[PDB]
Structure 1
Amino acid sequence: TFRRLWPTIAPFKAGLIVAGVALILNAASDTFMLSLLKPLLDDGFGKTDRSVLVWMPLVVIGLMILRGITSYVSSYCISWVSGKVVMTMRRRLFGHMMGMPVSFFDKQSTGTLLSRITYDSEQVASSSSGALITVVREGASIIGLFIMMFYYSWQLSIILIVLAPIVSIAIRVVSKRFRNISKNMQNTMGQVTTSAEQMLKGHKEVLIFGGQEVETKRFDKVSNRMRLQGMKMVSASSISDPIIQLIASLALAFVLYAASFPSVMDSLTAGTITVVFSSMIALMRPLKSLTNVNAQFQRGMAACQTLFTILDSEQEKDEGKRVIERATGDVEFRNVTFTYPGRDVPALRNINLKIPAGKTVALVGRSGSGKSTIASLITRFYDIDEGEILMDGHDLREYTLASLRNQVALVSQNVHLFNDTVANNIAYARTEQYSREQIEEAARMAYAMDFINKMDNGLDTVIGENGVLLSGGQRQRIAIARALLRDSPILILDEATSALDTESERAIQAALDELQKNRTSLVIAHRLSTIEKADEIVVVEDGVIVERGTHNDLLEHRGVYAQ
């Protein structure tokens, strides 16, 4: 997976290499601080000299200011590659998510989409850089310390080379056994954890049936099991490191025994042995991290693989041919066979529904099925499987999706509002073309200045981020204002307000009449007024046309005509 991530990080190598050289110097400023111990004792408290000891406090600041300056440079210029290999791939994920079919947001992935761009994005540069802060730094501390051992005491360095790899495999095997036991139990605590959710959801039945005592008893039992596995998990966790320390001490003791087993040893000065022993203690942490540097790296790269799954999914079907400036004619349906993806029940049978030019087709307000779904096919939110839809007396498959949707203009109370200025919001992707000269008149005839004027900055104000939070009816009104860039052939109004707010419902009715003077329409009709104002109501229910005819026919065949 790192193979595929490499092109994404490749142009941002300049920060990486500076991180890969400012960390080696961070490994050669911890193995060179220790070397000064040999001058400090052999030449400072052995051969008694002040000249050899007065520059020591100087060089134990220069090395440490180097440690600080290289640590900052590493943590920054590796944060810079962890700011241009997480930001660029965030931008790629967002640019691909916007194009992906809306069916994906229909419970293929519904709430994790933030975590799939924020946290799961961060764990490709907060725990893959942690495998290049450690492979280089702690993997160079080992090399530096071994170079020190060779330069000072080959006699004990050979012994370390014999032993330390054995300590490493010991560390790995005990860590692996602990990890197996830990992740074996993780499913167990998850299973006993969801049990409490199962009780908490049914607070209702728990209250109604005779008592909670039988429920409290079971909760007590599962809590006791929770604890008696949690303590076992901790015992497995906190015993791994003591055994590691003990086996590492076996090396520290075997070297000390080998420091006197022959007469060849014990000829080493105090400085050399103090340096050697200090180095052995400073070899523990890098050995432990170099073995652990396959956990972090593979965690990060598996999370990146899952991000790649999100990124690699099929784009929206972009095979349309004809660019429509205006579908001057009318929309027609023809034998459309559509099913909700992920389901088996067909959503719509063969439909041949005629919507005429310059008029409106209403729909049965409460069909119970296939009411809002039929509005989907004009906007190609979910593409049709078989059967065609005739834009302007021309098939929809022939039309580019952007071109298709430029024509359509949806309105509903559930309309999600953009968050830039009102001037941009009304003319989103059209601000340079449709200037405020149009937007002033649009807000005039929108009947929405009761909140745009009252906002006191309505001509230019941020409309989202919950900045103003116009109510849902006002969202419908400003949706009409959005459509008041006009020339939109199809006008889908969900009309699901169910609330005749004072003059606002009459306002949207008047604006609908204005948008019906020149443009077509296709409305879901719950309100009786629109049903009367409808021109040809092709009522459809249960995936099949049940009745066709204008208001007089619907009065003749009431069906569900009420109130």
Structure 2
Amino acid sequence: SRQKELTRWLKQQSVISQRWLNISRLLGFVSGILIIAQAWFMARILQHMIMENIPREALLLPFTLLVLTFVLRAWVVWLRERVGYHAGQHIRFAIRRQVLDRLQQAGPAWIQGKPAGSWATLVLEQIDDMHDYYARYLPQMALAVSVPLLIVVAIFPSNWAAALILLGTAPLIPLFMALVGMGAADANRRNFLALARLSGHFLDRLRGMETLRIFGRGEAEIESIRSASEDFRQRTMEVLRLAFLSSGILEFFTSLSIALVAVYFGFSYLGELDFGHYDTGVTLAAGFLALILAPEFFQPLRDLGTFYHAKAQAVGAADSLKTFMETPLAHPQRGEAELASTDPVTIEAEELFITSPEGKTLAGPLNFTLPAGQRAVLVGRSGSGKSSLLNALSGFLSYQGSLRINGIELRDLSPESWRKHLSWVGQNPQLPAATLRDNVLLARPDASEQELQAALDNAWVSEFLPLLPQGVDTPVGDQAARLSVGQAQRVAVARALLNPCSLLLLDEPAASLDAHSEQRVMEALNAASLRQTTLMVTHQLEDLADWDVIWVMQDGRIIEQGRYAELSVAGGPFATLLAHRQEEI
């Protein structure tokens, strides 16, 4: 239903590398001339030695010209394939560049909305689906209208009956393809839902093979696989029985045109058919020209049919890439005001409404104040907007209201300079660098080795380095494969403790860690949370008596605020929250 405007998007993305698609259209015209020259030289050579009985040694010039047109024709086929690739490559490099540009300025707020395996599909597997639309389908659609018109133009002076046989099928092919194309469109729609259900049936019975085992349904799911495969087979054979007629319409008219050209020329040579020629005896070279060129008239149409799948999956790729590039989402504004000093900051919020990039409000009205050097705690149930406040405080989320850091509002604070005074630790630590040493030094690449070693000593990461093979320079691998979740989270602590900061945001560290790493992370992060303003989200709800204030929220609003002593005995929401933690071992 969206084909017309999706294809308009596809055809507008091709303005880049327009000279590659212009050379490929011009090389398809040149290739259609070498096809005609090939058939004309063969027809004259064949006539000379069949009718005039000229020896092959007296035909050296036509043979030389025939070999030359074969070398030129193979040259443009090589040239047209390389030029066609360059067309597709430059759209893919430009679309990917502006997909990664949009996906970076949107920031982590929008990226985490979808799993990273689904972003890699968009950037790496769907952008590449558009290559064969520009490399093959678009050039072939030019070859399908350029070359066939050249054969008709080339044959017409010699014999208008032969050119009428080829031109006569030009309207009759799309007429019958559309006649059977609408009989194969209702088959798609009346089997669309069932084939969608039946496609993921095997992977579903294969993921849930644990549940089948414990219930003893393994031998009864073999029959369902059989019954679902029989149903899928015969349901999609009805679609294919009509989709193979459309391809068989073209094979019918290329078979009828070759047969009919042979009969017309064969019978006219014997005197059975007088029409067709321009009041002159039909020569043998005229018949060979029309017989060599008859299969070449329909070859561009046959090759285009093999490239239609390229257009189908390019539109499916443009289906998801057009919506992505036109989603209305607004970024946090970046005022140019550098922070005054590298001292602990006094963050205070008058009335905040932290909003996602799509406009949804994540955290309701927030009324709080964190004085310089004061460490707070955010606690609450899941989905309560605890992490949304830390992302907004980092600049990743747009807010309406007043959130002033050290007296200056966050909206008019320079993100380049504000984030130099911001260090933070998040749950599920991400290690982007290559080596463990270059990953700690990511925070401050200019760190000295004595400052670097102190960070590794303070963060309790040098006490598991000997377990690592290469030590400090151990390659972390993909998704921190080498390091355990507890060990990687301690490395994330190391680069937080490297540079002194004016504000430390700990978004639930040591949450999913093992028992020993949780003790080591918290100990190294509880003594580092009392030398600058920190803001820790946690679910531990215990040993918080040393923290200055506790902000508990549900549904994105601070409901209770105070020290641990006054909330544990107050019986309020914190006590209800604290009782849940003690309920589970």
Under a length normalisation based on structure 1, what TM-score does the superposition of the two structures give? Answer: 0.83
Correspondences of 1:321-360 after superposition (within 5 Å): 321-325=335-339, 326=342, 328-337=344-353, 348-360=363-375
Q: Would you say 1:490 and 2:495 are equivalent positions?
A: no
Aligned length: 558
Correspondences of 1:40-439 after superposition (within 5 Å): 40-47=45-52, 48-54=54-60, 58-100=64-106, 102-107=108-113, 111-161=117-167, 163-174=168-179, 176-177=181-182, 179-181=184-186, 183-184=188-189, 185-193=191-199, 222-255=228-261, 258-259=264-265, 260=268, 262-263=273-274, 267-289=281-303, 297=311, 300=314, 303-304=317-318, 306-314=320-328, 316-325=330-339, 326=342, 328-337=344-353, 348-364=363-379, 369-384=384-399, 386-422=400-436, 424-428=438-442, 431=445, 438-439=451-452
Q: Displacement, 1:454?
A: 5.7
Q: What's the counterpart of residue 25 of structure 1?
A: 30
Determine if contact 1:130/1:297 at 8 Å carries over to the other structure: no
- Please give the secondary structure, in 2, of the residue aligned with 1:518: coil
Under a length normalisation based on structure 2, what TM-score does the superposition of the two structures give? Answer: 0.80
Return closer, same or farther for 1:24/1:461 CA change in 2, 3 Å cut-off: farther
- Please give the secondary structure, in 1, of the residue aligned with 2:127: helix
Q: Displacement, 1:424?
A: 4.7
Q: Displacement, 1:230?
A: 2.4
What are the ranges of 5 or more consecutive residues in structure 1 without an aligned counterpart? none
Determine if contact 1:413/1:472 at 8 Å carries over to the other structure: no
Determine if contact 1:15/1:77 at 8 Å carries over to the other structure: yes
**Match for 2:247: what amino acid?**
D
Q: What's the counterpart of residue 481 of structure 1?
A: 494
Return closer, same or farther for 1:530/1:77 CA change in 2, 3 Å cut-off: farther
Give the Cα–Cα distance (whole angstroms) in 1 for the partners of residues 407 and 472 of structure 2: 39
Which sits farther off after the overlay, 88-97 or 540-549?
Answer: 540-549
Q: What's the counterpart of residue 552 of structure 1?
A: 565
Return closer, same or farther for 1:457/1:112 CA change in 2, 3 Å cut-off: same
CA RMSD, Structure 1 to Structure 2 (Å) = 4.0
Q: Displacement, 1:362?
A: 2.1
Determine if contact 2:177/2:249 at 8 Å carries over to the other structure: no
Determine if contact 1:332/1:353 at 8 Å carries over to the other structure: yes
What are the ranges of 5 or more consecutive residues in structure 2 without an aligned counterpart? 1-5
1:273-306 deviation per Cα after TM superposition (whole angstroms, max 9, x unaligned): 1221221122122244568888855763563364
**Match for 1:360: what amino acid?**
R
Give the Cα–Cα distance (whole angstroms) in 2 for the partners of residues 88 and 437 of structure 1: 45
Percent identity (aligned): 20
Correspondences of 1:526-541 after superposition (within 5 Å): 526-527=539-540, 530-541=543-554
Which sits farther off after the overlay, 435-444 or 303-312?
Answer: 435-444
Give the Cα–Cα distance (whole angstroms) in 1 for the partners of residues 159 and 489 of structure 2: 82
Q: Displacement, 1:450?
A: 3.5
**Match for 1:336: what amino acid?**
L
Q: Alignment partner for residue 484 of structure 2, among 455, 458, 471?
A: 471
- Please give the secondary structure, in 2, of the residue aligned with 1:359: coil
Give the Cα–Cα distance (whole angstroms) in 1 for the partners of residues 382 and 293 of structure 2: 80
1:17-50 deviation per Cα after TM superposition (whole angstroms, max 9, x unaligned): 4433443333333332222221222112322222
Give the Cα–Cα distance (whole angstroms) in 2 for the partners of residues 320 and 4 of structure 1: 31
Which sits farther off after the overlay, 276-285 or 233-242?
Answer: 233-242
Determine if contact 1:31/1:141 at 8 Å carries over to the other structure: no
Q: Displacement, 1:121?
A: 0.7
**Match for 1:226: what amino acid?**
F
Determine if contact 2:379/2:541 at 8 Å carries over to the other structure: no
Determine if contact 1:24/1:140 at 8 Å carries over to the other structure: yes
Return closer, same or farther for 1:543/1:282 CA change in 2, 3 Å cut-off: closer
Give the Cα–Cα distance (whole angstroms) in 2 for the partners of residues 64 and 85 of structure 1: 32
Return closer, same or farther for 1:323/1:459 CA change in 2, 3 Å cut-off: farther
Determine if contact 1:539/1:548 at 8 Å carries over to the other structure: yes
Determine if contact 1:490/1:520 at 8 Å carries over to the other structure: yes
Determine if contact 2:129/2:314 at 8 Å carries over to the other structure: yes
Determine if contact 1:181/1:233 at 8 Å carries over to the other structure: no
- Please give the secondary structure, in 1, of the residue aligned with 2:428: coil
Give the Cα–Cα distance (whole angstroms) in 2 for the partners of residues 418 and 285 of structure 1: 51
- Please give the secondary structure, in 2, of the residue aligned with 1:492: strand
Q: Give the structure with the larger helix fraction.
A: 2
Give the Cα–Cα distance (whole angstroms) in 2 for the partners of residues 292 and 220 of structure 1: 31
Which sits farther off after the overlay, 208-217 or 15-24?
Answer: 208-217
Q: Alignment partner for residue 518 of structure 1, among 531, 542, 560?
A: 531
- Please give the secondary structure, in 2, of the residue aligned with 1:98: helix
Q: Displacement, 1:522?
A: 1.3
Return closer, same or farther for 1:324/1:427 CA change in 2, 3 Å cut-off: farther
Return closer, same or farther for 1:139/1:121 CA change in 2, 3 Å cut-off: same
Determine if contact 1:330/1:357 at 8 Å carries over to the other structure: yes
Which sits farther off after the overlay, 74-83 or 489-498?
Answer: 489-498
Q: Displacement, 1:93?
A: 0.6
Determine if contact 1:495/1:526 at 8 Å carries over to the other structure: no
Determine if contact 2:377/2:551 at 8 Å carries over to the other structure: yes
Which sits farther off after the overlay, 508-517 or 124-133?
Answer: 508-517
Give the Cα–Cα distance (whole angstroms) in 2 for the partners of residues 195 and 456 of structure 1: 44
- Please give the secondary structure, in 2, of the residue aligned with 1:362: strand
Determine if contact 1:35/1:148 at 8 Å carries over to the other structure: no
Return closer, same or farther for 1:126/1:461 CA change in 2, 3 Å cut-off: farther
Determine if contact 2:328/2:358 at 8 Å carries over to the other structure: no
Determine if contact 1:419/1:465 at 8 Å carries over to the other structure: no
**Match for 1:318: what amino acid?**
P
Determine if contact 1:90/1:121 at 8 Å carries over to the other structure: yes
Q: Displacement, 1:149?
A: 0.7
